[PDB]
Structure 1
Amino acid sequence: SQVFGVARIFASFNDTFVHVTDLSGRETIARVTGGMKVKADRDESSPYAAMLAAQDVAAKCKEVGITAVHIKIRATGGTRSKTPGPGGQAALRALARSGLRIGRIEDVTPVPSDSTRKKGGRRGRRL
């Protein structure tokens, strides 16, 4: 009965994605991003924008013909953060509100075994 997707929320700092796909992954549905719904450069990762994006994605899904999703969350990963952004949670909330159903939530952030050299240099990033 329930037609599924995989939500894929790439929640980096300074932008969020919501990238709904089929179960194989190849054929997408909607790729809606934070910077797409709020033209302010700053307001990309910002929650409201993320929420809007999520809503848009949901709408797209509805148009297509899908009922449920599998939340996968990706923080920037590897050389950066490994910390889910400000607007992943917000996006999720938005999705929930939309009524597009939810099943099996994961964080598939690519946390390495032993990364190749990080940002900054040795003395780091000195504001």
Structure 2
Amino acid sequence: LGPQVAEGENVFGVCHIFASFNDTFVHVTDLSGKETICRVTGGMKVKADRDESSPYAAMLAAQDVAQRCKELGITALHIKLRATGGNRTKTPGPGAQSALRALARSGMKIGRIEDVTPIPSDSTRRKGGRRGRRL
């Protein structure tokens, strides 16, 4: 069920970890990034908008993704981590670290980590007003 690769060699795919403050996306796709293998989110595991971005939902999503990818023959993963970016926050949400550790403990081999978040040169106007959000 996948490529024919010797025991010593590992098949590589990239994993996009979109860690917003509303939920977390774990999205494994090919090295080229065009064909996807498993994409499950934190909202697909917890039925409560509160916990959509919790570390627990990210852990469950990462475990599901790692299991499906192992069933599909990929043993090594390339991690690229993204925050919301744009004019909004640049710090990744709480689910990123939990998802990374979850897919590490799931037997997956770890490639090289990279931080790919949209960093505007000089963006448009941020959503909040001149006085900003007041809550």
Q: Does 1:103 align with 2:105?
A: no
Alpha-carbon distance, 1:111 to partner: 1.1
2:126 is matched with which residue: 115, 118, 125? 118
**Identity over aligned pairs, percent:** 85
Q: Indicate the SS of the match to 1:106.
A: strand
Which residue, 9, 16, 19 being the options, matches 2:24? 16
Shift of 1:79: 2.3
Which whole-Å CA distance do the structure 2 matches of 1:39 and 1:55 have between them? Answer: 17
Over alpha carbons, which structure has the higher Rg? Answer: 2
For the 8 Å contact 2:79–2:114, the answer to whether it is kept is yes
Q: Which runs of 5+ in 1 are unaligned?
A: none
In structure 2, the partner of 1:56 is: 64
- TM-score, structure 1 as length reference: 0.97
Q: Runs of 4 or more off by more than 4 Å in structure 1?
A: none
Q: Which residue of 1 aligns with 2:14?
A: 6
Q: Is this contact kept in 1: 2:90–2:117, CA < 8 A? A: yes
CA distance in structure 2 between the aligned counterparts of 1:26 and 1:48, rounded to whole angstroms: 28
- Partner secondary structure for residue 71 of structure 1: strand
Alpha-carbon RMSD: 0.7
Instruction: Tell me which protein shows more strand as a share of its residues.
Output: 2
Alignment size in residue pairs: 127
Contact kept in structure 1, 2:18 and 2:84, CA below 8 Å: yes
**Correspondence 1:69-84 to 2 at 5 A:** 69-84=77-92
Out of 52-61 and 110-119, give the one that drifted further: 110-119
TM-score normalized by structure 2? 0.92
